[PDB]
Structure 1
Amino acid sequence: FPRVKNWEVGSITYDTLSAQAQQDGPCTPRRCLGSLVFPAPEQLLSQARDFINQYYSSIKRSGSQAHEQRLQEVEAEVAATGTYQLRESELVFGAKQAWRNAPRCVGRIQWGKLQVFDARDCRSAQEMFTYICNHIKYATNRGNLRSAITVFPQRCPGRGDFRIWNSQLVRYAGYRQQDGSVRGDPANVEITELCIQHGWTPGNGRFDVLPLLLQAPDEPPELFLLPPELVLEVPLEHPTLEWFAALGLRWYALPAVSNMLLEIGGLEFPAAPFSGWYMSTEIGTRNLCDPHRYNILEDVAVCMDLDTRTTSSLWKDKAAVEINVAVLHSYQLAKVTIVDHHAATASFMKHLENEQKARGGCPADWAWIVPPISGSLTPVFHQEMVNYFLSPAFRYQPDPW
């Protein structure tokens, strides 16, 4: 078992949980690919049997009558139907484990506090849309955000997939420009083009909320506009730099990932959007300061009267810190849940300790856990981590187009 050192404290643990890692990752003893972003009945039975084992351990009924009977129930169903159905309590437990197991999520101290909406009876894209609106309404909760997931019907033989084509429920349009630039969010150029191609009349602002493209099985995707009142947003201002408000920047309250696959016990839910709340660096650092995103860093630094002609002034670092301050101030002013990178990483350390006692380790992707600014100022920088895949899990999946 790998030994894991924390260099700030000097302490040492062994990740015995990694030994149970089911699926395989991208590294070998020849070479590490840790930094890469994107790395049959008997085998369904095998995954199902293991998850069922997990569930019955969690309810302190391991090896019980009910446990054996559920094993045989799942075997009979797979033999007879090629698949099987989760009980509602198993789905709730599966969804929480998927969050708990997500190595790149720094917010996992909260994994047990998750609201699971069971939309496995959903029938169409219209019903899907209503479920999604209710998720957004509940999660947003007028700024006091609540973690949630809505699970749409599972992949099953004979029918197509439910799919949300959008990568998040709230996304700003990215318009390819006259001269070749992008107006709005460049991360969303492709989904923006798909939306117009599917009948959306575009806007031309920098913060135009996209419609949803919702796909029912064996159906073309269907365009749905979100009611403006469900989409809570936060104008960005800076507590001391009054000119900052004249940038006209905004961001939305709810981070709701909608393009990932939820796998539980070998069953695959290709549509299962989940939401929590933002860590301020996602917005302040990545969304606003990535060169390939809104790319405001230089314009802010010029306004700050920094010397932008030499890197050694650290104008980039200074302007990025004030952009992050503005995000935190703006969300607190608006009374919208947000966490800074110091508090989030400090809570993730408590998660790693809880997980050490509970399971013998914690799958964690150092390069995603450490924030994109002030890395070594946070405790996770000095924490060695073991990255591996546990199931239940959220997986990436191809775009449906």
Structure 2
Amino acid sequence: FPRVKNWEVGSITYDTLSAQAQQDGPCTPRRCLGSLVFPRKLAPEQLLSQARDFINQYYSSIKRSGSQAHEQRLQEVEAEVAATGTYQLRESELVFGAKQAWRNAPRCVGRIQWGKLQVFDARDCRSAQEMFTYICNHIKYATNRGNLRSAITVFPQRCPGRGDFRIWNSQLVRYAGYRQQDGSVRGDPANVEITELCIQHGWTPGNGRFDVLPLLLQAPDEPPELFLLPPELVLEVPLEHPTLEWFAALGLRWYALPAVSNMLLEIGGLEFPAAPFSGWYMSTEIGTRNLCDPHRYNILEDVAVCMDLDTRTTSSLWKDKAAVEINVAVLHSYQLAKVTIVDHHAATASFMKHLENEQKARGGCPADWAWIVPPISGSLTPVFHQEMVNYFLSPAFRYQPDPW
């Protein structure tokens, strides 16, 4: 049982939940690989193992462990896999599993909200046109005219033989990225690859820096099909600053809905390669990483020039000053648009409360310090001084290979 200390207050706890981890991480006594973005790289009796644990979890949480439906539901999954080699989740199990995978995500700082999650069950999906309608329902429900609500849509599970449902975009809303002889990029450099697949599959491109890409939706065994997103359905926020009048003229925008559409949801040994989930943004994601990363929109120096900052010496802290103002413009613009957003101080303080909750309830919480601490102003937030333990519990969201 690892001892975990908070260096701001002096309080000590012990993480007993870590003792119950399975899927081993990347570290060994010889070396820690905690900072690696992808840990390492990405006969059916082991399906029954992960399923019996999950069903025991489910009846644990609804109190009804021992007797009744508990040691009843243990049998049909046994018989389902005995009969068919896989099994179907009950809808309440699918709901409970989706919430747990979120609760279990070590890199997610928004997990105080894990209990409020709307699960759309898309397991009877059959075509790519159907997926598109499901995705469009999700986006409409999640966006909710700017009053965002966490949501997940679970597409049919991976099957013995036969292909997989798959969204080729990394998120549901992505901006395009186009090159030149320059090798430079117009738009988002994170999305250069998928932008060229969209074109490779027939997308007439666009002119500028904020073109919402079309979706590539992959029904099982068939090639992807391009689906264009309705402009009515993609809520966006033009960026303005509350006091720097010229900021709006930079023409910056970002979208309302953060919806991750390329991770594999794993519940009770079943795999859902298409289960896009969405919540709402923390402002540093947009302001600091998407707009200021050198390999993203890289706008930092352009803003500093407009603020008349001394970009001729690092010790002026011109980068820090312009970055804060970009974050101020993000928070201001989303509030003025009445689009849900949370600043990194509010988010991290909520995550501390979540750590306290998870301590009482489960004896600890898997947390990835490098991802929980915000990318600006880290030590000004309470999670910086909190020691954390990182480990893998199931259900889980896992990374998966791109279908290329």
TM-score when normalising by structure 1: 0.99
What do residues 280-329 of structure 1 show as CA deviations (whole Å, max 9, x unaligned)? 00000000000000000011011111000100000000000000000000
Question: 1:322 and 1:385 mapped to 2: Cα distance?
Answer: 30
Question: 1:211 and 1:64 mapped to 2: Cα distance?
Answer: 51
Question: 1:100 and 1:351 mapped to 2: Cα distance?
Answer: 10
**Partner SS state of residue 380, structure 1:** helix
Question: 1:45 and 1:115 mapped to 2: Cα distance?
Answer: 28
Question: 1:303 and 1:137 mapped to 2: Cα distance?
Answer: 37
Question: 1:171 and 1:64 mapped to 2: Cα distance?
Answer: 49
Q: CA deviation at 1:69?
A: 1.4
What do residues 317-350 of structure 1 show as CA deviations (whole Å, max 9, x unaligned)? 0000000000000000000000000000000000
Question: 1:395 and 1:209 mapped to 2: Cα distance?
Answer: 26
Residue range with higher mean Cα deviation, 175-184 or 128-137:
175-184
**Partner SS state of residue 299, structure 1:** helix
Residue range with higher mean Cα deviation, 172-181 or 204-213:
172-181
Question: 1:374 and 1:37 mapped to 2: Cα distance?
Answer: 21
Aligned pairs, number: 401
Q: CA deviation at 1:42?
A: 1.6
What do residues 26-73 of structure 1 show as CA deviations (whole Å, max 9, x unaligned)? 000000000000003221100000000000101111122211111111
Question: 1:110 and 1:379 mapped to 2: Cα distance?
Answer: 18
**Partner SS state of residue 92, structure 1:** helix
What do residues 321-380 of structure 1 show as CA deviations (whole Å, max 9, x unaligned)? 000000000000000000000000000000000000000000000000000000000000
What do residues 79-138 of structure 1 show as CA deviations (whole Å, max 9, x unaligned)? 111110000000000000000000000000000000000000001000000000000000
**Partner SS state of residue 399, structure 1:** coil
Give the alignment partner of residue 171 of structure 1, picking from 160, 170, 174: 174
Residue range with higher mean Cα deviation, 176-185 or 14-23:
176-185
Q: CA deviation at 1:158?
A: 2.2
What do residues 239-289 of structure 1 show as CA deviations (whole Å, max 9, x unaligned)? 000101110000000000000000000000000000000000000000000
Counterpart check, 1:85 vs 2:88? yes
**Partner SS state of residue 50, structure 2:** helix
Counterpart check, 1:36 vs 2:39? no
**Alignment RMSD, CA only?**
0.6
**Partner SS state of residue 223, structure 1:** strand
Question: 1:291 and 1:158 mapped to 2: Cα distance?
Answer: 43
**Partner SS state of residue 181, structure 1:** coil
**Partner SS state of residue 170, structure 1:** coil
**Partner SS state of residue 179, structure 1:** coil
**Partner SS state of residue 65, structure 1:** coil
- Show structure 2 runs of 5+ residues with no match: none
Counterpart check, 1:366 vs 2:369? yes
Q: CA deviation at 1:179?
A: 1.3
Q: CA deviation at 1:178?
A: 3.2
**Partner SS state of residue 75, structure 1:** helix
**Partner SS state of residue 291, structure 1:** coil
Question: 1:28 and 1:204 mapped to 2: Cα distance?
Answer: 49
Question: 2:93 and 2:179 mapped to 1: Cα distance?
Answer: 45
**Partner SS state of residue 266, structure 2:** strand
What do residues 140-178 of structure 1 show as CA deviations (whole Å, max 9, x unaligned)? 000000000000000011210000000000000011223
What do residues 1-28 of structure 1 show as CA deviations (whole Å, max 9, x unaligned)? 0000001110000000000011100000
- Counterpart for residue 209 of structure 2: 206
**Partner SS state of residue 305, structure 1:** coil
Residue range with higher mean Cα deviation, 156-165 or 258-267:
156-165
TM-score when normalising by structure 2: 0.99
Question: 1:162 and 1:268 mapped to 2: Cα distance?
Answer: 11
- Counterpart for residue 316 of structure 2: 313
Question: 1:63 and 1:284 mapped to 2: Cα distance?
Answer: 50
**Partner SS state of residue 69, structure 2:** helix
